[model samples]
Target: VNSFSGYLKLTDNVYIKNADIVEEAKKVKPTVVVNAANVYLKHGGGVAGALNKATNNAMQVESDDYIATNGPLKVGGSCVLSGHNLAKHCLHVVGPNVNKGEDIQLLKSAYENFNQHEVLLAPLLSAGIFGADPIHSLRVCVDTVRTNVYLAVFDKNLYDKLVSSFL
Candidate 1:
């Protein structure tokens, strides 16, 4: 079974752990769940895909409707959507795609909205497919918000590295 394991504690409010991001959010029921999303807020792949599955595709429908009305999310910008059984609300954070010439500022901006949540459960934003450096991306997250943050990580290597370094 997928299990949640505490690996590192950065502060009483910030820590990294090995867990399913969906399941961890279900447990904590953070004020808002964060998604590492595309500019379109498409939950079709990567972290957003997994989060979409957790909501049984309801998230995609909500996101689609939102985008249809308000237009695509800006890179480094965000919007809030209603969640499903997964969460009451979702924070759709659009990070930069390295190949597209967007840089770390936008990735850092992607994480800025989480400060609105007193408790936040989030995955590694932009660390996959979007071509962000995991450790560098991590530093941005660490520096960005002051909420009670849970960094729910799925990769074993990342869990180990987070434990050993950047504590």
Candidate 2:
């Protein structure tokens, strides 16, 4: 499933490809990888859990160390931690909890403010346990790209929805 099942182009430089976020994170050349993070930087569930597991628990150690020294990441705030064995660094940004009526701006901030690099690999933020709509979350994900971006969606249904953007 590493091959493109479908894709959406934003600019000549920007595009979203259909692939597994965890797999892509492991294989891609050294670059910044964004995690759909939490305030405590706990590598709990969703993409965060998989990545933590993929790195052989090294990410959790660094994450706990980060929170131990740097304090909890606020909503919509971001910080970098050891990428472990995954890549260069992991950009950890806490997104809005739409389940508790958090504003969508926090999600956008989580997406837009983490624009510190060119080649960005992002999962659809706020669409998992945070309760944001996939299409709206995806729209924000795509709209905020300044350069090249490869989006990851594990489910084929979401992949089909991602492809629908170009249809």
Candidate 3:
């Protein structure tokens, strides 16, 4: 698993090139690929429930779990876009809070953890509109000190295709 921010910074000038991700996907080339993003839990009281119902059908669920405990998912960096609303095979990067570290270190943690199988790929993601931002949410959970970023990779062809399609 890796963070979006860190991946962009690779080699001083590494870039995704295409912003139209969906359209870009039409000409994708890859043997195996891994995509990651964040999920926002603030979209609706039933979003998590819907996810469980559609995919993890055997799992038990409670509506109360989606309550306003986190104050509407507008706090973190990718909080709004963390969940189901992804474009391709993706891992919803997430984690518990930290005690203290450099700014970059904290980013490194969230960016490094979390993975999702293709089945979990969703049509939409949560941003401030629906999910909390990743950066802000970390502060609430842990006494975050440093913010490090994590880098992830994928078949370049697939990435190029996605950008052309989406943007």
Candidate 4:
């Protein structure tokens, strides 16, 4: 389930609703292309109807890996060339700092899985392409991953208050 992973990964921050317990589990089976246990609603009220209800609900999470990624990249960190890939370009992201957490892994997995699944981007992840400034690469990465994402920013005043002193 597309929504299930988000729900499980961030329990307090994300959730799922109006989904059938029995059918959702049955769809997990790999034995059949059409998982009979999970019924699909073609016409009237059924699983599809339930999904429609849930999809419309409000959902949000706090994910900010892009800021972390940019911190190093902005300082001219070593860039490992991913040579000869079909991609327009290849850049190897080294292991994150000791302070990093799952947001890094989640962001990496989301990109890797999507690419591996051959899913094309609605708006390609163009590092700093829009602003015409390459220094915004991290900003692009952060915002790109943030696309289709519903997240709530916390400690609004705290980060500003602390960082403002630097400015």
Candidate 5:
């Protein structure tokens, strides 16, 4: 069974645990769910793919329009849109590629831009397809968001590993 073990408080209003992102988002009904997208907002893989599916691909349409008007999203910028199936709002931010020196800054920028929400649902940004170090990414996320932040984990083993590190 994929069980969630701890609240695993990191910073104020920042919590991490094992749970399906979509399921947790539904239960918490957060004001916004954040996605780690590319400059083009293509969410075809990783957690972003799951989020795209959860939103019924409506997010892609909105993202296309936004990109059309605003140009490709920058690594340090964010795009906010209405959610169709998962959240009231959806925030997409470009994630840095592996070994990018700007990963922390860009992540912090994304978090700062999305900070207006009272509650936000986020994954371990850049840790999957983007090839970022999970520990570094998690720390940046916890340190960046000022609002209530729930970091979702789909893999039970990954969740337990994180908990063990902090326990």
Candidate 6:
């Protein structure tokens, strides 16, 4: 069954293939795409880097100035951006390090930092570059976000299996 909250409808199948996170943002046309960043907003690697690259490096430039003036964000804290190459807004959050005992709560906190966009595209938190277990990370996301989640999945087979189990 589809999950509903307020005016947003959580999709029954959360997985979307044939797209990386950037592609998914374009296709879904979501108001915001949540990016995983460090406290310092360094987009040197992982999902943060990919998002910065896709957005034409606007995030990095903005983050640099923001951090310089305001200091680093706390874990799970977020900053929003516009004129992004894909989504209208980009939500940056400080995701936990891999295998951290508090990762679930940290991931959930990141989702909570979202600013109530109807559709949000997300990479698999802690699963890919962070090297955390996929199932656990996905569960944390499902448990946290109130709005419909449009996941950008690169691996078709793995995506399919996850959909079978979760959707």
User: Which number leads on lDDT?
Assistant: 1
Which is better, 2 or 4, measured by TM-score? 2
lDDT (Cα, tens digit) per residue for candidate 6, span 88-158: 78877666766445454677777676436666777776666766666677777777766667666667777
lDDT of each: 0.79, 0.76, 0.28, 0.23, 0.75, 0.68
Which numbered prediction scores highest in TM-score against the true structure? 1
Query: What is the TM-score of candidate 1?
Result: 0.89
Off by over 4 Å in 5: 1-6, 99-105
Measured with C-alpha atoms, the lDDT of residue 10 in candidate 3 is: 22
TM-score winner between candidates 1 and 2: 1
The TM-score measured for candidate 6 stands at 0.79
Residue pairs that clash (backbone atoms under 3 angstroms), model 2? none
The TM-score-based order of candidates, best leading, equals 1, 2, 5, 6, 3, 4
Task: Provide TM-scores for the models.
Answer: 0.89, 0.88, 0.26, 0.18, 0.85, 0.79
Give per-residue lDDT, candidate 6, residue 29: 59
lDDT of 4 by residue, 1-167 (tens): 23233221222222222223223333322111110001111212222222223323110000013233433331112222111111221222222221322123323332232222211111111111112222232233333343222111112353233224321
lDDT winner between candidates 3 and 6: 6
Candidate 4: where is the Cα deviation over 4 Å?
1-95, 98-143, 158-167
Q: Is candidate 1 or candidate 6 better by lDDT?
A: 1
The local lDDT score (0 to 100) that residue 30 gets in candidate 5 is: 68
Writing each residue's lDDT as its tens digit, candidate 5 over 1-167 gives 12233557777678887888878766666668888778888878887788888878887888888889988988867788886777788887776767555555566676676577777778877777787777777777767778777788788988888777752
Model 3 score (lDDT):
0.28
